[PDB]
C-alpha cells in the first residue's frame, strides 16, 4: 500500500531512482485492493498472476538500467468494456460473463508498449449504459467519498478505483459523460478526448459515433501523461484521427492570463442544484483571480442534449448490440429449441433491464414510419448542438461549467427511475454530440460529496484544456484528501 497514493509522475521517478522495485509497487497495489475493494467494489477480474510476472520482468529491466515507457512500473486499472487479450472482459454483463478476448485492443497494445502494468478490469454499468454503475450484473461500486452514494456511471469503477488509492490511473469510455460524470462524482480528474483522438479498436461499442476512451487520475498532470500514451492514429480504426502532435504536457504550468473563457448561461441553468452552482461560480472567480477572462455566452440547444443523445445513442446501440446472438460467444440460452428462440432467449436473458430499454427505444426510433421523425430529427439537432460550439469557439478559447447538475446521489435513489437518472447527463452529452474534448476536475464538496468543474475545448486541442485545468488545480484540489479517503 505504501505507494497506493503516489501520483503516476512521482511513482514513475520513484521507480527510475531505484527507490522502489516494480515487484513491490505491484505488491502494494494488491494489498490495497485486498484491504479496500471489499468495500469499494470497483474491481472485476484481477490479473494478479500476470501482473506479478510482468513486474518481475520489470525488476530485471530496472537493474539492467533499461527502463523504457512513458508509464513503466505504473499499475493500471482498465474499464471492462475495453478488450484485454487473455483477460476476462464482461462489459459487466451476464451476456459476456466468462468471455475471454482472443485479440488485443489498441489502447492496451499502446499501454503495454509503454510497459504499464495491468492490475485488472474495472466495474461499470452494463454495456456502458447508466449513470450510477448500479446496473452492473456483478456488483455495485460505491463512492470513496461516501459509501452511501453512487460513484457515477458508466465508468464508476474507474473513477472509484483511482479515488480509492487502488491504481494511479485507469481507463474509461465516454459516450455521453461516462468518464466525466463519474470523475465529477468521485472528485477525480477525467478526460474524454476529442473524437478520433483515441482508437476504438477494442472498445466494445455502444455508439460508434459517440464513444471514446480516456484516462481518470488523481491530478491533471498524470492525466495528460496517460493521454499521450493512448492517443495516436490506428490502421485498425478508420475514424482514428491522423494528428501526430500528442504532447499534451507541453503547456501545463503556463499561465492562463488572457485566456478567453466562455461560460454558457444554460450550464448554470434551472436543472443545476444550488450547491453545484455555487461551487462553479466560485470556480469562475478563481479563474478570474488567475488572469483568464470569463464572460457569459449562450449554447441554446443545450436543452436538447439529453433527448437527441438518447435517441441517437440508443439507435446505434440497437445495432451495435445485435452481434450478441450467443452463437459465436457470450451467453447462449440452453432452453432454446428454435433459431428465433436462440436469438430472443439468449438476448433477453443475457441483457439487463436498462440495456433492453435502449435497444427497444433504438429499434423503434430506427424503424419504418418513425425513422425521419425520431432518429433523423435527432441527427439534425446534433448539428444544432455542434453549431452552438462553433459559434462560441469563434471568440473563446475554452468553455467552462459544472460536469453534472448535482453531487453524487444515493445508492438506489435513482436506480428505479431512468427519467431522473437520465437528467444527470445535462452538461455532458453536448460534448460527445459535437465531438469536442472535455475534462472534469474537482471544484468543491457539498456534504462531503465532490463537485465537478468541466472544461470543453476545441477539437484536438486537449493541451489548452490541460493548461487551464492545471492552473485551476493549483488553487483547489482533493490531492491531500484521498489519503484520508
Amino acid at each position: 500500500m505504501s505507494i497506493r497514493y503516489e501520483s503516476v509522475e512521482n511513482l514513475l521517478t520513484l521507480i527510475k531512482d531505484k527507490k522502489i522495485k516494480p515487484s513491490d509497487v505491484v505488491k502494494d497495489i494488491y494489498d490495497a485492493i485486498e484491504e479496500t475493494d471489499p468495500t469499494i467494489k470497483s474491481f472485476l477480474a484481477l490479473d494478479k498472476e500476470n501482473a506479478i510476472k510482468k513486474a518481475q520482468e520489470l525488476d530485471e529491466l530496472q537493474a539492467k538500467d533499461q527502463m523504457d515507457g512513458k508509464l513503466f512500473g505504473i499499475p493500471m486499472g482498465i474499464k471492462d468494456n475495453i478488450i484485454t487479450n487473455g483477460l476476462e472482459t464482461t462489459c459487466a454483463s451476464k451476456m459476456l460473463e466468462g468471455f475471454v478476448p482472443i485479440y488485443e485492443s489498441t489502447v492496451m497494445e499502446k499501454l503495454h508498449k509503454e510497459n504499464a502494468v495491468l492490475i485488472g478490469k474495472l466495474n461499470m454499468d452494463e454495456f456502458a449504459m447508466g449513470g450510477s454503475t448500479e446496473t452492473s450484473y456483478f456488483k455495485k461500486t460505491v463512492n470513496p467519498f461516501d459509501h452511501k452514494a453512487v460513484p457515477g456511471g458508466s465508468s464508476g469503477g474507474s473513477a472509484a478505483a483511482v479515488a480509492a488509492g487502488l491504481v494511479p490511473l485507469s481507463l474509461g469510455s465516454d459516450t455521453g459523460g461516462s468518464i466525466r460524470q463519474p470523475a465529477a462524482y468521485c472528485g477525480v480528474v477525467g478526460m474524454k478526448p476529442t473524437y478520433g483522438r483515441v482508437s476504438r479498436f477494442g472498445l466494445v461499442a455502444f455508439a460508434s459515433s459517440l464513444d471514446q476512451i480516456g484516462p481518470l487520475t488523481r491530478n491533471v498532470k498524470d492525466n495528460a501523461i496517460v493521454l499521450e500514451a493512448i492517443s495516436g492514429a490506428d490502421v485498425n480504426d478508420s475514424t482514428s484521427a491522423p494528428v501526430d502532435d500528442v504532447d499534451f504536457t507541453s503547456e501545463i504550468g503556463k499561465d492562463i492570463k488572457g485566456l478567453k473563457v466562455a461560460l454558457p448561461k444554460e450550464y448554470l441553468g434551472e436543472g443545476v442544484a444550488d450547491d453545484v452552482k455555487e461551487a462553479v461560480q466560485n470556480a469562475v472567480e478563481t479563474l478570474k483571480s488567475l488572469g483568464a477572462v470569463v464572460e457569459e455566452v449562450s449554447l441554446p440547444n443545450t436543452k436538447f442534449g439529453i433527448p437527441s443523445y438518447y435517441v441517437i445513442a440508443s439507435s446505434e446501440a440497437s445495432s451495435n448490440l445485435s452481434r450478441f446472438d450467443g452463437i459465436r460467444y457470450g451467453y447462449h440460452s440452453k432452453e432454446a429449441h428454435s433459431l428465433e428462440e436462440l436469438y430472443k432467449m439468449s438476448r433477453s436473458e443475457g441483457f439487463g433491464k436498462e440495456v433492453k430499454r435502449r435497444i427497444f427505444l433504438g429499434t423503434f426510433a430506427l424503424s419504418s414510419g418513425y425513422y425521419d421523425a425520431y432518429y433523423k430529427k435527432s441527427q439534425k439537432v446534433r448539428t444544432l448542438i455542434k453549431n452552438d460550439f462553433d459559434k462560441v469557439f469563434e471568440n473563446y478559447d475554452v468553455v467552462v461549467g459544472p460536469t453534472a447538475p448535482t453531487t453524487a446521489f444515493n445508492l438506489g435513489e435513482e436506480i428505479d427511475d431512468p427519467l431522473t437518472m437520465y437528467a444527470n447527463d445535462l452538461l455532458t452529452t453536448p460534448v460527445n454530440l459535437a465531438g469536442l474534448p472535455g475534462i472534469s476536475v474537482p471544484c468543491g464538496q457539498s456534504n462531503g460529496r465532490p463537485i465537478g468543474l468541466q472544461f470543453i475545448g476545441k477539437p484536438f486541442d486537449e493541451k489548452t484544456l490541460y493548461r487551464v485545468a492545471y492552473q485551476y488545480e493549483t488553487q483547489y484540489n482533493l490531492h491531500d484528501v484521498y489519503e484520508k479517503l
Binding site: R200, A205, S238
Partner: protein
Amino acid sequence: FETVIGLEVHVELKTDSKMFSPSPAHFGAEPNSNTNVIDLAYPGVLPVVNKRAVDWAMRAAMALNMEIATESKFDRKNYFYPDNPKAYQISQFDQPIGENGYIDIEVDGETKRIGITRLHMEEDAGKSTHKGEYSLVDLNRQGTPLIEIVSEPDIRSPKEAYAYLEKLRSIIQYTGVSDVKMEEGSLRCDANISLRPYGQEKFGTKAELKNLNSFNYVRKGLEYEEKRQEEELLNGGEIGQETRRFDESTGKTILMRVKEGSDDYRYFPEPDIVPLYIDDAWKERVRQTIPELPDERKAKYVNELGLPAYDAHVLTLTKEMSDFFESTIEHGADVKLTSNWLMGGVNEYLNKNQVELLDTKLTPENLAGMIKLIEDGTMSSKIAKKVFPELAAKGGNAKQIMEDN
C-alpha cells in the same frame, strides 16, 4: 398485360482480401479457418475498407454507363441470421457508388436499351449448411466483397431477362473484377415480376423469385411465374406481395412466404467508415483502366474486318476469347477462317472438354499456324479433325504432328 420484371444481381469481386477485413477472399476446404475477429463480429472490432474493391466497383459501374458518385458512404443493413454475425451487412443505401446506367441487348425483335438504376458495394455473408434438425455455420466466405446491381424495371419477358444476364455477365467479365460464373457463385441473381393489365395502372400480385442458379434457370422460373400469375390474374387471383422459391427439378416456383409489408432493414449511415470523396483524378485512373467492351468491340468486327452478325456476338462473349481471336488475326490467320474456327470447333472443343481455361492449353501463337497450314500450305480441312484436339491439349504446332505422325 405487360409482365414487368427487374433483376437484382450480386457479383463477387476477386480481390486478395475481404471487403472490410484483411482476411483472404479465397479460402480452402477447412471451415472457419479463413476468418479473424472482424469477420467473426467480435465485440469491439471495426471495418476497414478494401481500396481495390472500391476501384473495381467504380470500374464496373462506368463500364455500365452509370454516373459515378462524388460522395459515397456506407450504410448498415440490419438483420439477424447465423450467416450475418454483426447482425448488419455493411452496404450502401443512398449514394450508391453508381447510378442510372444501362446496357443494350438484342432480343428477337431488334435492339432494346435496358436501364440499370444502381450499383453498390456490400460484403458477402457466411454459408449455413443444413445438417439434421440443426444448422452448421461456416464464416469462411463472410465479408467477401460483393457489388449489387439492380436493373430498372425495364425488362419485359423471361427471354429479355436471359439476354440481360448474358450481356451484363459479359461486360463485367471484361473488367476483370469477377469470374462472374453462376456455377461458382461469383454471380448471383434474383428476379422480381408482376403483371399489370393494360389500360390501368394497378398491378396484380408481385413476387420475388429465389433460388435461380443459372441464366437458363432464371428464364424457366421467370416464364413459369409469368404463366402462374397469368392464371391468377384471369381466374380470380388474390393480389399480394410474395417471395417464391424455384424448384430446379419440377420447374415450378413455390410460395415460401407472404410479405406483411416492406422488410424493415433500418438502414443508416455507417459511422465506423469515413465517407468517400471520389474526385476526378481518381475517376480518371479507373476510367482509363477499362478496355474496349463487348458492344464497341463487336461494332469493330462489323464494318472494319466486316464479319457477320452471329460471329460478332459469340467472339465477344468473353475477353480472352476475343483477345485470342485478335492475337491470332494479325499473326497471319484469315479473319473469317479463325472466326469460323473459334465460333465452332474451338468453342465446341472447350464446352465438350470443359476446357474453360482457354489460356493454358493452346495459344494464338500455336493456333495461328494450323490455320495457315490449312489455308495454303497443305491443302484442305479433313485433317483439321484431330490436328486441332492434340494441338489444343497437348503441343505447340500442328505443323509438327502432321509430320511427327
